[PDB]
Write a protein that binds this DNA or RNA. Sequence first.
RNA 1: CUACCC
RNA 2: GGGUAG
Length: 1203
Amino acid sequence: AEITASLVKELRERTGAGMMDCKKALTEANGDIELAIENMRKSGAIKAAKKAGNVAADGVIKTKIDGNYGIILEVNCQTDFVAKDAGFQAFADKVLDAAVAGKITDVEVLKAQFEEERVALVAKIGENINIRRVAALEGDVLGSYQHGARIGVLVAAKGADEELVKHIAMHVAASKPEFIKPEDVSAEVVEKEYQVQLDIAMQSGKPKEIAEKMVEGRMKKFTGEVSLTGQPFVMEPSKTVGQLLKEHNAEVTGFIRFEVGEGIEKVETDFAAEVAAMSKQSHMSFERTKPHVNVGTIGHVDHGKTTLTAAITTVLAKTYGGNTSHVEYDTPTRHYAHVDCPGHADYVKNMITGAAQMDGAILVVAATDGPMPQTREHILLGRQVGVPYIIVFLNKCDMVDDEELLELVEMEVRELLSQYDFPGDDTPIVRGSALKALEGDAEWEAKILELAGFLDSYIPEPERAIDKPFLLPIEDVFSISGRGTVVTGRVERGIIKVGEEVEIVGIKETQKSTCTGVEMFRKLLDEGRAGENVGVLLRGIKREEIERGQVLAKPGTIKPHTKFESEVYILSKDEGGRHTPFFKGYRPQFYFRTTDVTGTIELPEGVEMVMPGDNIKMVVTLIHPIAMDDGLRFAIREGGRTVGAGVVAKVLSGASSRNSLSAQLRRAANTRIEVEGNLALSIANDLLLAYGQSPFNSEAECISFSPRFDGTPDDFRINYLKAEIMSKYDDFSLGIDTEAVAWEKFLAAEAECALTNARLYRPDYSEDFNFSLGESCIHMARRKIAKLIGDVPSVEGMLRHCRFSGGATTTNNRSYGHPSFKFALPQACTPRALKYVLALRASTHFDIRISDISPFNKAVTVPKNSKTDRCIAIEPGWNMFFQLGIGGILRDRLRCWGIDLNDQTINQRRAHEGSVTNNLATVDLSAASDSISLALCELLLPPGWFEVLMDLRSPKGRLPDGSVVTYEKISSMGNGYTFELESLIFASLARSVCEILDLDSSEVTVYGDDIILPSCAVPALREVFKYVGFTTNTKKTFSEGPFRESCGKHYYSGVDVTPFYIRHRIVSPADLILVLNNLYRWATIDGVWDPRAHSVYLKYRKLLPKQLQRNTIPDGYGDGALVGSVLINPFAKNRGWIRYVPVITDHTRDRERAELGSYLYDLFSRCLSESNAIDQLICRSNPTKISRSTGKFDIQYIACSSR
RNA sequence: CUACCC
RNA sequence: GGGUAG
Ligand SMILES: Nc1nc2c(ncn2[C@@H]2O[C@H](COP(=O)(O)OP(=O)(O)OP(=O)(O)O)[C@@H](O)[C@H]2O)c(=O)[nH]1
Ligand SMILES: [Ca+2]
Ligand SMILES: [Ca+2]
């Protein structure tokens, strides 16, 4: 205590400075007013210049116009909350209309003209409030659209008005052009990239007017992009602005656009990172049913929330015990989760998208200075985001020596709470210092204990989801003879016991029914707890009365509505959403619980465009009701892709494509086209000519032409595609060929496999003397295998990996391939493999139908080359179930050698390296999966594994030739684990060939047969393989070349030469859409054609029907249409502020699904679920439907985007 | 159930 | 069979 705490307030409410900055500027002011304030006025610029190592990343833009004189601004702070407050507003508004009177262009002018007032606020607040930039534009008619606060645009036109300059400023705001015309560039910024790409291009070997053409066209596009001219108007992205302008009676001159924090780059601060470092300094000086409470810390920057969250960690470590950017710590009763609230607009994008909700925020305010002016925006963010409860902590109280003065600050926070309808009178306020508690000062450590003593009490215990009014999302429905109607899904909330009454509410009149019973897969329980994945039986109600997305809750618990107010975030461009804003008539689908629902939206008063990366309040009125209550997270899909997220706020009162077009296309889609011969051979020929290269003379040369491996990448690429494109043309006329040849090989794949299987059974040469390279590797591989594998497949890892999947079984066929027709229909087991199926049968109360019991798999033939076919083999559907389980445990496990098979990227990326590096070699075997000996496999795998592989495998096979064979190969293609095994085998050995040569085994990467290793190892790997039986595809194995190929990617000196193949006979316009598209990808860079390919594209493009030449789509959307610019598509209609397009689909008459087997599978899926932009968790899995390919083509409509 | 591939 | 995007 020094002087009275009383009229220190006289300082504050006449000044606005700190509390102790007021008392301490009074202790050396002799109890005087003015001369105390003059200390502040002079010692306010000292702190104001203390602000310079505080980067100002936030702020506002403000804009003004008079008659036809317009001005923008970039006055900016370092925090949202400040910018939105009535102070930063008042100054920045003032400093804006100061440019209205005086056309101030030099920022220096007004940056100085208010420097003495710029300090009046940073002394009041505590942030580097500095003006960044200013500019202004004069003209005829100049309009300005202000996007809330963050983006300001000033644009000047001619012949235009508010029915325009508004709308185009919106585009400038939206599209962000740097220039205005393609002619508005310097022949230096142009001849920069014009000499930057010309080498990039010419290095390839492409002539003068190829590279020159290509580059000029690409730069013509590059210019065209930023070209406000060459820019698709944001409200009509069909016509360009420049086109919109000339088509209008008008012509703009100039434009100014500011955002906030351009270039103000900075470095990204994590919270949970630096707080583990703020702690690390002070470091050196049963009950798991305990609730989760999401707390947040909120307050000024320099009041050091940072410092306090740290104390609330260490002092809680000291005492009890112990979405990233959050800290997980405990308390003896509860377990919290704690986050920082720096950005108002980034906390909404946390609550809305649900990355971090709030069950109670903590209000940090340094007692030294008390409530800052912008704090009412912190408290405002609470009663804006609907935070339930609020605890306040006054940090740094040692910096006050008078309690009579501390009690005065609670006044100025308790009344600041109460303005915002928070229990200010009855709200907890802790007085202490974190700084003292970081140390070891337990007198002040009792304050964090007094604070954490409030989170334990003043925050209510979260209604644990079990305890909430029962509710289940209807995910799918089955009509079982014997059970009636049954729905499956994970129950969201509550418990459902057998018999209770439930409503079935969703779209129809909220009907009601009763739980005839509940069941899982193994258990057939009687109560269904929340969080569990179940199937509930309903009576007196059939399937057709129950849709999906319906809920299944207690009666009256939740009513169905269709009108509600919500708040949503829209995914930014870089986040996945639209790269285009929408306007008044947005009509998306609203993905709710399990189903998508379309719907219109209103914009609140005064907002007219919203862009990717926005928060926004809106009112949603969807086409037909869904059951809802406040707190329901719904994403927002546009044609299957999630471009928004949002939660319902308040539930309310309640309330163009040409069909002739689609039908015109459907007509033409089925238009079989007629050619005077082989269209392919024609196209490929007329293409080779298009490149100087000598064409095919006969139809034999298509597959007997071997390329050359010299020449420029260009001389290659083409020469390669030549030898490659035709390879797979099945329909070759006097192709005196067959599939018999496929069989002829499969005979060696056992005939050799015989030879090895045998000679692989006597490794004692004669007497010990000779020591072979193979045997050694096997020995090494064997050891290596078992460290990776196990002595036997863990049933744990076995059951949660086995599945019914795909297509043909011995008992089924491609029609009856979908998994439900495996539980419905009995599948074949195999003698040895019986025991497992029996396990399944005591593993559930369901029906496990074994049809025949035979050791036979059907060996057949599927098409491959034009010179041969495959000889896959269709396994006994039960063997396949387990084979797929051991194929999965042998794959998740195979990932420790750095082998990922659900990612063939990491094996083709390395083909890239190899093509340049020359130290990596791609390899290929002749009959890969087929030449794996029953002998070899025994020598490597553990005996316990080699059992389970002899058990599941099919030992004998019946041919179409009637004749049986007994497998020398352990496993054939089509077998349910063969891929993973041959991976692991090949990987095993490459790696042994590595250790054996003092080489990193970690440099070995295998994908099935597509194994990649160090180039030096190859002749050893080759000599190993020669021994272990396999034989090496010299033609496809590449070590010394400039060329590497792997996982379907081909490379030549780091350069992409992946060809495309013309498989089957081109006939329907879908087969020409397809070929024209592969040639489009193969010869384009960003919609910019390699000229001499464009020639044939354009030519054979004429072959398609008139409408089927203009119907373009972006790449990566299918082949239902030619890829091109969808901005052009005449058939593309603008529905609901989202563009929709028509693409060729295959026709499907629907069919009957096995309600039994579909249900059997749906609940088997939940057994496999249960034992295995942060918002895709919302979206669930799909019901089983079956459909049959008719032959006709239908036209389906989808959703699209520019680029 | 369309493309790409091991 | 298996990935990968539809
Ligand atoms: N089970 C199964 N595996 C396949 C099939 N197609 C390709 N593969 C895998 O792809 C690997 C290599 O395929 P390819 O390189 O095309 O054929 P390959 O039989 O191994 O030998 P070649 O084509 O003669 O060089 C094989 O080991 C197979 O495991 C198939 O239809 N069924
Ligand atoms: Ca191969
Ligand atoms: Ca290969």
